[PDB]
Structure 1
Amino acid sequence: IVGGRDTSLGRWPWQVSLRYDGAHLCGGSLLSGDWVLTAAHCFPERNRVLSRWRVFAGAVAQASPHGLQLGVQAVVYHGGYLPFNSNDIALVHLSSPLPLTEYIQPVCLPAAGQALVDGKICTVTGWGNTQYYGQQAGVLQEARVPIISNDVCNGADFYGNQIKPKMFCAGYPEGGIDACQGDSGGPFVCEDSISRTPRWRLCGIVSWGTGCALAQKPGVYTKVSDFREWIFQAIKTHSEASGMVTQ
């Protein structure tokens, strides 16, 4: 995350770090004690031995001895993810569930029919680079960015028609604050009180962008509302699966 700030324990309790052979590669969001929602592109051919992945939760410092690390039982990625950029979404089933504590909590999904509010300012978090030619963050970072309309984002001066309908952009025309390499798969959350209580919901999944924090090249996210049914199905369908599977 470029242009963000260090955050503290318990603030974004759904954030997890997905590590392969010891390195942090992607972010992810807990949907329950044993299911994580992330991006499909975090599982290229060279990173598909489930035994080599670990999910780290409950700490904001990557080197905290107090976080919990569990294995992966299965990964279900979207079959429509043609690179295997639309449908850049996947579900990760942990081998055992995490306890839910004041530091580990799931995030909510958008309600049926709930649409993105253009202009609304949401939060994006992660341990990715704080500069494109920089290093990953030691402590989880958070930044607030507004949702941009697809009309603006698909214009010739932004991403000239590369934003498909199940993805959206968030950022400032001016650049300066954005997600970056190492943040892929993590959360883009917006808070609302439609259930009469303020709750944070996962509206987007960090997916891609050209460079990081450049003006007119905002970050692009997978629009979670469009995959609600895919998620509900996948979990039912594969609760007892092991391996890389597609839905």
Structure 2
Amino acid sequence: IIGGTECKPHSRPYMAYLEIVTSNGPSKFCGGFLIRRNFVLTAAHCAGRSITVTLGAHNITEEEDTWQKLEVIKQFRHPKYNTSTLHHDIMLLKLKEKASLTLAVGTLPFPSFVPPGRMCRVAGWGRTGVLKPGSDTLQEVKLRLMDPQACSHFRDFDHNLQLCVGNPRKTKSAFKGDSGGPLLCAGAAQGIVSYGRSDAKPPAVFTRISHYQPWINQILQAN
């Protein structure tokens, strides 16, 4: 997160921190969010050979008694996930066991009107600048949902599938490692951090959750 502030600890109890062993071996981290006791929603490009989720965290380098660390038993990448167009960057993770709902660990509701111009919030443990490490503490920033035309420089941007997030006239932005985290507008999950410019200039591109709700329901109903 760039230009944000440290979250009040545990004030965003749906937040998941993902440790990912990629197929090759090198580790990666992403954000995500709890939507059922045993399901986390995140970005598909965060898939790997194995994933562990940490719920209830604030400083991710220091365990607290609020922590629930759960192994992922199955990854469900969207079937149309496309590395050429970067479309359909969304994935459900089934946890090996159900998390316990507590004050520090809870689920995030879905919606079902947010047009360009609305102010949203995104939280994550991603890098806090181009030459900065990931943040040890959960950070959050308020970002403007932009008209899709503000992302017209991104090849293949599709307003039906994606959101354009972050005023280009300011430096505030989601950034590397915030991928998979939710964009919250009016207390509902509206987007998932997907990608952006390496040089951190907003806007960034998010997956539009509303478009995928029937797929999410399909996966949940079959589990």
State the Cα deviation string for residues 216-235 of structure 1 (Å, max 9, x = none): x4111000000010000011
Matched, 1:181 2:176: yes
Corresponding residue number in structure 2 for 1:20: 20
RMSD between aligned residues: 1.7
**In 1, distance between residues paired with 2:137 and 2:71?**
22
How far is 1:83 from its partner? 2.0
1:75-104 deviation digits (Å, cap 9, x = unpaired)? 111111122911100000000011111111
Q: Secondary structure at the match of 2:36?
A: coil
| Structure 1, 88-97 or 162-171: larger mean CA deviation | 162-171
Pairwise mapping of residues 16-165 of structure 1 onto structure 2 (< 5 A)? 16-21=16-21, 25-43=29-47, 47-48=48-49, 50=50, 53-66=51-64, 67-83=67-83, 85-111=86-112, 115-154=113-152, 158-159=153-154, 161-164=155-158, 165=160
Change (3 A) 1:219 1:212: farther
Provide the rounded CA distance (Å) in 2 between the counterparts of 1:82 and 1:129.
25
TM-score normalised by L of structure 2: 0.91
Shift of 1:212: 4.8
Deviations 1:151-190 (A, max 9, x none): 2322xxx43x531120011101213111111111111111
Report the count of equivalent residues.
215
8 Å Cα contact 2:114-2:185 kept in structure 1:
no
Please state whether the residue corresponding to 1:41 is helix, strand or coil. Answer: helix
Check conservation: 1:178, 1:212, Cα contact below 8 A.
no
Q: Which has the larger radius of gyration?
A: 1
SS at match of 1:31: strand
State the AA in 1 paired with 2:193. Answer: V
Instruction: Summarize the alignment of residues 193-208 of structure 1 with structure 2, pairs less than 5 Å apart.
Output: 200-208=187-195
Q: Which residue of 1 aligns with 2:211?
A: 226
In the alignment, structure 2 segments of 5+ residues that lack a partner are none
Q: Deviations over 1:125-144 (max 9, x none)?
A: 00000012210001000000
Q: Matched residues, percent identical?
A: 31
Deviating 4+ runs (over 4 angstroms)? 21-24
Aligned to 1:243: none
TM (normalized to structure 1)?
0.83
Give the SS at the match of 2:220.
Answer: helix
Equivalent of 2:163 in 142, 145, 168: 168
